[PDB]
Ligand binder design. Sequence first.
Ligand SMILES: [Cl-]
Ligand SMILES: [Cl-]
Ligand SMILES: [Cl-]
Ligand SMILES: [Cl-]
Ligand SMILES: [Cl-]
Ligand SMILES: [Cl-]
Ligand SMILES: [Cl-]
Ligand SMILES: [Cl-]
Ligand SMILES: [Cl-]
Ligand SMILES: [Cl-]
Ligand SMILES: [Cl-]
Ligand SMILES: [Cl-]
Ligand SMILES: [Cl-]
Ligand SMILES: [Mg+2]
Ligand SMILES: [Mg+2]
Ligand SMILES: [Mg+2]
Ligand SMILES: [Mg+2]
Ligand SMILES: [Mg+2]
Ligand SMILES: [Mg+2]
Ligand SMILES: [Mg+2]
Ligand SMILES: [Mg+2]
Ligand SMILES: [Mg+2]
Ligand SMILES: [Mg+2]
Lengths: 172, 172, 172, 172
Amino acid sequence: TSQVRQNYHQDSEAAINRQINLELYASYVYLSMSYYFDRDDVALKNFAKYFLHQSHEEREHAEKLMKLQNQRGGRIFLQDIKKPDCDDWESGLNAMECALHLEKNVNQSLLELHKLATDKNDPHLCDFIETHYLNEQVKAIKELGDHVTNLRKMGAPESGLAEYLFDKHTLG
Amino acid sequence: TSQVRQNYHQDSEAAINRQINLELYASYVYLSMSYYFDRDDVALKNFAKYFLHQSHEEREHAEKLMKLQNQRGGRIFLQDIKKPDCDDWESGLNAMECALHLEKNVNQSLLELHKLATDKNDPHLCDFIETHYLNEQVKAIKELGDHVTNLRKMGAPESGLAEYLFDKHTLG
Amino acid sequence: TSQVRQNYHQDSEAAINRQINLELYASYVYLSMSYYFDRDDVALKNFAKYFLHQSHEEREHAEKLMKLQNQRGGRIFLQDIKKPDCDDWESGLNAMECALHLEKNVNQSLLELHKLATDKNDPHLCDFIETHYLNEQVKAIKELGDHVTNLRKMGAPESGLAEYLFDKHTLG
Amino acid sequence: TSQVRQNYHQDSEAAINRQINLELYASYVYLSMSYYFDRDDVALKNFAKYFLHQSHEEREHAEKLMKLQNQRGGRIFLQDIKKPDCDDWESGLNAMECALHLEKNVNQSLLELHKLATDKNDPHLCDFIETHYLNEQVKAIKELGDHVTNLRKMGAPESGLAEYLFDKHTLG
Ligand SMILES: [Cl-]
Ligand SMILES: [Cl-]
Ligand SMILES: [Cl-]
Ligand SMILES: [Cl-]
Ligand SMILES: [Cl-]
Ligand SMILES: [Cl-]
Ligand SMILES: [Cl-]
Ligand SMILES: [Cl-]
Ligand SMILES: [Cl-]
Ligand SMILES: [Cl-]
Ligand SMILES: [Cl-]
Ligand SMILES: [Cl-]
Ligand SMILES: [Cl-]
Ligand SMILES: [Mg+2]
Ligand SMILES: [Mg+2]
Ligand SMILES: [Mg+2]
Ligand SMILES: [Mg+2]
Ligand SMILES: [Mg+2]
Ligand SMILES: [Mg+2]
Ligand SMILES: [Mg+2]
Ligand SMILES: [Mg+2]
Ligand SMILES: [Mg+2]
Ligand SMILES: [Mg+2]
């Protein structure tokens, strides 16, 4: 047993490894979305900037969980990072809707993680999830919801003018 | 023979003189496009600014090739600079499409130049073309493609509002 | 066909997508190595810092290739990022030897890419690989070779003192 | 009853007084360790500095719990501060191992405190423990584990050179 390990259930250790993989998957989804908007036939540079920033944020989320695993004396086990569900994201609105779905899936995984930590009476892990992940997810979901609303109200996806002006005024 | 000349084929010398003329022609096309958007019945000042900048860039491309000709001991021979294909460029979108076609023609000429330099085993000339011209062309073509895409998506040429807002937000 | 595409062979496009995946795989190997040295039973913080920096560099390599794909009018196709070959990297010396092997595999892939670009007469892609990748690989391989040499000469892996002092004096 | 007291169980009040005593005891252990390394026949000044800093930290932990007791309207009751288990700490490695054991005992006490606060439905006290104590303990335990690992790998306690160089390079 690790000399540092204390009050850290094997199920929690495994769930943290699963969450590391999910955060890396989310980084990959956002990377794919970013370079879709960099295509010469899409050409929305601030959508590309926004999703690249989100991608780098998710990698930071993954690294913090790797740090946590070692802090608690668990052992990191990595799995393949699956490619994103889509290659062509269709429109700025469709990408925003996909990101909203992704962030609500990641949130559900974090809530399941917190339920496990609660069931195993691990208050340090509960506080870690609350402090560093749960409100970040609530803010991300709210921001993406706001973006989806505005794009819909402006007339996207059919209005290429709507996505152009949203790119300039909200994401610029 | 020039006291500096070494490994510089006569065919390469001639091809450089042809490329000087083509760069000056491209400068002239962009100058014509610029002042079209300065007409009181067109009146898109940032299209005019953008194409004037492109025009001055092409003159710099031509001057660098003149410098290269003398560096290698070839002799500059100048020809008439032909007037651009059009007097009236119709719309911001049409001018962007014409510039895209121009830059892909200039790129093809540079690729033919590089093939000649390769066939004559002139690595200095190959490196000159690669370093100073080929990625500049790839960037220019990509930028013009992006501009054409956005103008189309926004509803140009029919939407005078589209070209107005592109002038402000992308070229401003 | 993409409006920007010119002199870009379909085989080159596919080879760039394969190289994107390889750079992301290398990012993942170095991420795994980094957090191995963050374990409480390994505890070499400057090895961990060094490999995390290398990991972020590889992600930058991947992003630049994604940018290139779009610059040339190819289409990015992503694949799963395979997990690294190992979970436990055994020692600082063993991790350095694995990184040396990785970088020489990545170099071989880049050389095959350059041979393809040469065979398809794509001087822009040749210059891209030369400018942004080939000397970076030669420098990386030389640095890792130097590190392996010093660790061996100092008495690693058996000497925990050797790896400790290398961590402080070379990687600190 | 105190005019401020609300939702503060008598068992929680007593457990906080016990935790005050434990934090003061930990301050005393680290003070003793510090001046052991100040002996002329031990003479490891950075071990002495490190443990004196830890000692002052524990006194700050105790004072914050005294503040909490009064914030919630409980009444501080102090007990004797027991002398540390040892007078001679033998070596830098042995002192680090003793500190690791101490911090894992203090953590266990804090986890028992949190379980009590949870059982008494005291979310303010739960949050206090999580915010100010539980991650501090996880970080302390991880740091001490790292230090023990390095000293072992370097050849301590038998190698006086190992402890000398650790004193300079890790604790300096
Ligand atoms: Cl367990
Ligand atoms: Cl519209
Ligand atoms: Cl559209
Ligand atoms: Cl000749
Ligand atoms: Cl309109
Ligand atoms: Cl109009
Ligand atoms: Cl082809
Ligand atoms: Cl030794
Ligand atoms: Cl060892
Ligand atoms: Cl030394
Ligand atoms: Cl009570
Ligand atoms: Cl010795
Ligand atoms: Cl000794
Ligand atoms: Mg995340
Ligand atoms: Mg699959
Ligand atoms: Mg030019
Ligand atoms: Mg004529
Ligand atoms: Mg690389
Ligand atoms: Mg596999
Ligand atoms: Mg070459
Ligand atoms: Mg304490
Ligand atoms: Mg006694
Ligand atoms: Mg709670």
